[PDB]
A paper describes a structure:
Glycoprotein 2 (GP2) shares a high degree of sequence similarity with UMOD (53% sequence identity), and has been recognized as a paralog of UMOD resulting from gene duplication. GP2 is expressed and secreted by the pancreas and serves a similar antibacterial function in the digestive tract as UMOD does in the urinary tract. Our structure analysis unveiled that GP2 forms filaments with its ZP modules, composing the ZPN and ZPC domains along with a linker that connects these two domains. Our study provides the first experimental evidence of GP2 filament formation and reveals the molecular mechanisms underlying GP2’s adaptation to a different environment compared to UMOD.
In this study, we extracted GP2 filaments from surgically excised human pancreas tissue and determined their cryo-EM structure at 3.5 Å resolution. In the cryo-EM structure of GP2, the bipartite zona pellucida (ZP) modules (residues 221−478) comprise the filament core. The D10C and EGF-like domains extend outward from the filament core as flexible branches, and no high-resolution densities are observed around these regions. To form filaments, the ZPN and ZPC domains from a given ZP module are separated by an extended linker (residues 324−348), a ZPC domain from the previous ZP module (ZPC−1), and a ZPN domain from the subsequent ZP module (ZPN+1). These regions assemble through a β-sheet complementation mechanism, where the first and second β-strands in linker region (L1 and L2) complemented the fold of ZPC−1, and the third β-strand in linker region complemented the fold of ZPN+1. The side chain interactions between linker region, ZPC−1, and ZPN+1 are predominantly hydrophobic, with some additional electrostatic interactions. We observed extra densities for four N-glycosylation sites on the filament core of GP2 (Asn260, Asn291, Asn342, and Asn362).
Author numbering:
A (entry chain C): 221 to 238, 252 to 263, 275 to 323
B (entry chain B): 349 to 477
C (entry chain A): 224 to 248
Amino acid sequence: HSLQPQLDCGPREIKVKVVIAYLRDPNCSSVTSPVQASACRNILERNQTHAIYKNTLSLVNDFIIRDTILNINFQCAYP
Amino acid sequence: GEFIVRMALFQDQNYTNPYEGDAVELSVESVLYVGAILEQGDTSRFNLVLRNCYATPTEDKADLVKYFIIRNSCSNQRDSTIHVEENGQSSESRFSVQMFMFAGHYDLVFLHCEIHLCDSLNEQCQPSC
Amino acid sequence: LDMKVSLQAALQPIVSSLNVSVDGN
Ligand SMILES: *[C@@H]1O[C@H](CO)[C@@H](O)[C@H](O)[C@H]1NC(C)=O
Ligand SMILES: *[C@@H]1O[C@H](CO)[C@@H](O)[C@H](O)[C@H]1NC(C)=O
Ligand SMILES: *[C@@H]1O[C@H](CO)[C@@H](O)[C@H](O)[C@H]1NC(C)=O
């Protein structure tokens, strides 16, 4: 399986295109996310001489769900 | 006084040998069987209707979002699999829902209900719908 | 005649699905 989720790290917005979707923190529900690490719970991992913004978007058919979620774990590796 | 009403969780459509109940783990596809019982009460003529059994992702009964389970005294719509088996006449009222868990990030689903104690003497309040 | 009743347990599902991962610069 593969979706080819188009992730397009910008200078101020992380944007991931691929039902309601939401980031780790319940808002940012439309998919965009500000690059500010204090916004919708973006994970910061500064491995040496780089900085990656990891996040786990989730797609669910209805706000109640039955046996099917879409846990898209996308990261942005900035210089 | 207080007509203390209790409700438990049974494991099967089989309405006995239920779960003891501390924190139940279920397949989202699976089914659970909760029945409101009028234990420790009149039970000779007082029925037990199921008016507003509902669900919410918080111990508190006052949440912004909450699952309906059954509104307006019976059989909430919008749910594919709902069965109020014997709510109403008997001192035991039973209904079945498929497991679920809400939007956002919290795996904590709770069940809350509102119960009105009908009587079966010259009071035709069988819950009709 | 209109008391409120709650279930004394937590309903913990085992919802799980297809993990995905991607990269970007
Ligand atoms: C999420 O947005 C709702 C408005 O829909 C607001 O009530 C709530 O405080 C927000 N929560 C966070 C963590 O931003
Ligand atoms: C950190 O991870 C990125 C991911 O592509 C990689 O390019 C980089 O080499 C890693 N840093 C180190 C020090 O290995
Ligand atoms: C079903 O019937 C009774 C009560 O419903 C129970 O004692 C019996 O063990 C059950 N049989 C099963 C679950 O196979």
